[PDB]
Design a protein around this ligand. Structure first.
Ligand SMILES: O=S(=O)(c1cccc2cnccc12)N1CCCN(Cc2ccccc2B(O)O)CC1
Ligand SMILES: O=S(=O)(c1cccc2cnccc12)N1CCCN(Cc2ccccc2B(O)O)CC1
Lengths: 345, 18
């Protein structure tokens, strides 16, 4: 059993070295303009944001459904999101992992940037978590296991993720997870300093305006596990300022139904001292993978998507897991906007 | 309960990045 885990571990090292080779290849010469707007029939708007929208579209020739993320170049520039948006596309077209969203096509026109991903009708974990209330520990563990492997993958490429929350996680038709957003993802060796993320999920060292490293992702995993299993996040308040106070305080109250194993994991993930936080110690991610809360997890079977999911959203093209938005035209100027800012896209 | 305080907290919808 130990030599099978050792062989497992060596398989993982070998896999990651290969994945990095292939990542760096796509990363150094990214794809561009792999489709055009007219190839798609727009169906419905699935989301809106400060500098763009997401729309359900259907490829006319293939009939496959896609989520099309449309970003207004001029607003990206005004809101100082150029680097994040360039980073999102470049990372997504370069990464390759079972629990990431699949970027199929990207292109730009005079006005907008387009990223075209395989459509996941199940929607975001957020809506399901809020409706069901909370997930049981086995259920939460299923999702958490996929985030652990995803972070082992991203971190091996020197990518800090920085955007973990139920809002950015989809539940696909097999009940498995797809991580959506990479605007805040950044290739870094060592520390970085940008104040970014979501208040409930921010590690203390982010709030304290000191540098931080990939340990913030393991902290965020702790927040995610806690929120999935309890039904509410470990640090909440009416205003972000009040949330930050609680985060830095170092005090977490656990629900009475949390198992001893879960609480012990969370104390080590929600460790205010980053130098003592699981995933940032000498044994790296293995301290998490070998923790008793994950004793029953078959990491190989999770990676290969062989475990039966505890929840499969009701299979109905369907739009019901997304809200309704006022449909507006996609505007394309007769003049090229912000051409210099987005040459690499 | 804590969950009730959260359900009444006003930060129960999708959360924006800072
Ligand atoms: O629309 S998504 O759920 C989504 C994302 C990726 C693949 C998807 C495949 N099928 C269905 C939905 C999909 N999703 C990603 C985009 C929509 N927002 C927020 C948002 C909305 C509009 C513009 C930007 C942003 B953003 O903060 O970058 C968050 C979740
Ligand atoms: O060992 S793996 O399943 C594997 C791969 C990637 C990440 C992993 C994280 N934790 C655990 C196992 C993991 N993997 C790498 C080694 C074995 N092959 C060979 C293989 C195995 C099964 C089916 C087809 C091909 C491919 C899959």
């Amino acid at each position: 059993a130990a030599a099978k885990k050792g062989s497992e571990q060596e398989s993982v090292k070998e896999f990651l070295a290969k994945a990095k080779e292939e990542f760096l290849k796509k990363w150094e010469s990214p794809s561009q303009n792999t489709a055009q707007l007219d190839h798609f029939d727009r169906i419905k708007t699935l989301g809106t944001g400060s500098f763009g929208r997401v729309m359900l579209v259907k490829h006319k020739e293939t009939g496959n459904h896609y989520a099309m993320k449309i970003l207004d170049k001029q607003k990206v520039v005004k809101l100082k999101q150029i680097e994040h948006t360039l980073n999102e596309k470049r990372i997504l077209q370069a990464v390759n992992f079972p629990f990431l969203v699949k970027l199929e096509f990207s292109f730009k026109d005079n006005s907008n940037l387009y990223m075209v991903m395989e459509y996941v009708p199940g929607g975001e974990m957020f809506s399901h978590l809020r409706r069901i209330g909370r997930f049981s520990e086995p259920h939460a563990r299923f999702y958490a296991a996929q985030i652990v492997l995803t972070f082992e993958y991203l971190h091996s490429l020197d990518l800090i993720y920085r955007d973990l929350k139920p809002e950015n996680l989809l539940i696909d038709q097999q009940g498995y997870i797809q991580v959506t957003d990479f605007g805040f993802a950044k290739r870094v060796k060592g520390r970085t300093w940008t104040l970014c993320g979501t208040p409930e999920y921010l590690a203390p060292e982010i709030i304290l305006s000191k540098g931080y490293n990939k340990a913030v992702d393991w902290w965020a995993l702790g927040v995610l596990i806690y929120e999935m299993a309890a039904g509410y996040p470990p640090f909440f308040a009416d205003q972000p300022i009040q949330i930050y106070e609680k985060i830095v305080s170092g005090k977490v109250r656990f629900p009475s139904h949390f198992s001893s194993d879960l609480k012990d994991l969370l104390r080590n993930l929600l460790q205010v001292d980053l130098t003592k936080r699981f995933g940032n110690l000498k044994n790296g991610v293995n301290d998490i993978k070998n923790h008793k809360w994950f004793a029953t997890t078959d990491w190989i079977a999770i990676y290969q998507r062989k475990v039966e999911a505890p929840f499969i959203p009701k299979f109905k093209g369907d739009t019901s897991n997304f809200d309704d938005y006022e449909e507006e035209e996609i505007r394309v100027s007769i003049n090229e906007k912000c051409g210099k800012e987005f040459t690499e896209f | 309960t804590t969950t009730a305080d959260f359900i009444a907290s006003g930060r129960t919808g999708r959360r924006d990045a800072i």
